[PDB]
Amino acid sequence: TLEPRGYSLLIRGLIHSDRWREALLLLEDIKKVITPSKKNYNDCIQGALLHQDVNTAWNLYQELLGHDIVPMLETLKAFFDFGKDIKDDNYSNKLLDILSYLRNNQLYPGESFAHSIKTWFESVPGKQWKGQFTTVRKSGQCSGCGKTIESIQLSPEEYECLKGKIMRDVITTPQELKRFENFIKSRPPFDVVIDGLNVAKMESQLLLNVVSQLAKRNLRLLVLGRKHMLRDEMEEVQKQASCFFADDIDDPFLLYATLHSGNHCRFITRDLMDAKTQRLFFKWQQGHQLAIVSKLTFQRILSYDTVVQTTGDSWHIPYDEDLVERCSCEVPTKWLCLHQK
Numbered sequence: 608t609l610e611p612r613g614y615s616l617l618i619r620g621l622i623h624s625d626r627w628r629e630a631l632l633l634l635e636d637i638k639k640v641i642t643p644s645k646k647n648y649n650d651c652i653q654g655a656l657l658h659q660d661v662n663t664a665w666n667l668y669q670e671l672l673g674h675d676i677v678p679m680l681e682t683l684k685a686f687f688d689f690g691k692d693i694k695d696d697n698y699s700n701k702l703l704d705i706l707s708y709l710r711n712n713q714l715y716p717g718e719s720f721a722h723s724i725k726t727w728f729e730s731v732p733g734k735q736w737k738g739q740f741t742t743v744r745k746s747g748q749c750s751g752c753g754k755t756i757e758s759i760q761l762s763p764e765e766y767e768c769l770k771g772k773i774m775r776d777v778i779t780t781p782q783e784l785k786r787f788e789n790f791i792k793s794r795p796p797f798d799v800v801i802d803g804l805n806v807a808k809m810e811s812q813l814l815l816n817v818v819s820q821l822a823k824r825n826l827r828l829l830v831l832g833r834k835h836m837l838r839d840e841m842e843e844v845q846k847q848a849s850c851f852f853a854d855d856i857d858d859p860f861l862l863y864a865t866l867h868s869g870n871h872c873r874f875i876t877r878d879l880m881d882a883k884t885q886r887l888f889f890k891w892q893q894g895h896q897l898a899i900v901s902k903l904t905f906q907r908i909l910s911y912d913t914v915v916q917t918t919g920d921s922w923h924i925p926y927d928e929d930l931v932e933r934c935s936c937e938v939p940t941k942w943l944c945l946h947q948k
């Protein structure tokens with residue numbers, strides 16, 4: 608089921624003119640038959656902002672969020688761009704809410720968006736915000752202001768919080784569940800949990816390669832697999848690591864085993880995907896997923912959390928560069944550093 612023919616382009620062609628309200632009418636027509644695209648909302652929101660109708664813009668944005676649409680970064684950028692000319696507590700709170708959105712969803716502005724954020728903070732009267740484009744030292748200290756970036760390490764209470772909430776959703780087969788729980792609970796914590804079949808994407812001979820090199824690092828390995836794999840070179844894996852072979856069904860065992868093992872335990876699988884809990888999951892995933900990148904090497908895992916963050920008197924905002932294509936599984940390396948004087 609589609610939009611009424613050509614409506615997206617009609618909307619886009621209207622929003623700079625005095626007839627921009629007609630674009631909203633068209634949007635209403637679209638809503639009555641399908642969920643509008645993030646571009647549809649982007650266009651109508653910019654139309655509103657272009658004509659100083661800030662309430663209409665924000666209501667559209669909230670409507671979008673309500674449909675669980677992820678806004679275009681270009682849309683978030685528009686609110687900051689128009690914000691440099693707006694002096695009002697309520698508009699500012701909305702912009703700070705967009706920053707919380709980025710923080711909570713582990714998202715990052717593009718380079719010109721970062722410039723727009725910098726420009727906005729530096730435009731806020733009486734607050735003396737200064738922005739700089741920076742990197743972070745190995746220690747966790749911003750190369751700009753000297754502050755230490757939030758630790759990537761969850762506190763024990765945070766970890767118990769996250770681990771607790773995760774379990775209640777895990778509790779496929781009841782028979783396989785209890786068997787796995789018995790397996791795990793009668794064994795010491797592991798150091799790396801390996802999803803055997805998922806890692807074999809870059810066959811069984813690839814699994815041996817991973818296990819055998821990780822074993823030389825004096826790590827306690829747990830390899831997770833399915834019944835079908837053991838039908839030779841798999842026997843060489845079973846002897847170098849602890850293994851659990853579940854039914855050929857997706858299973859939740861990787862999470863359970865890693866979390867049960869504890870805050871120190873890392874894992875290997877494919878790219879993984881209330882605000883406070885989700886925020887903890889992102890932070891835990893960032894600091895615990897071992898990503899593989901001839902001879903095998905893993906992605907660096909930093910000591911600090913690469914995420915939009917604040918101390919009130921400072922913000923640190925990772926951003927993507929135009930000239931740098933970043934894989935989903937690597938964290939940005941460039942930061943916008945904002946500090947009050």
Ligand SMILES: [Zn+2]
Nearest residue numbers: 749751752944
């Ligand atoms: Zn800084």
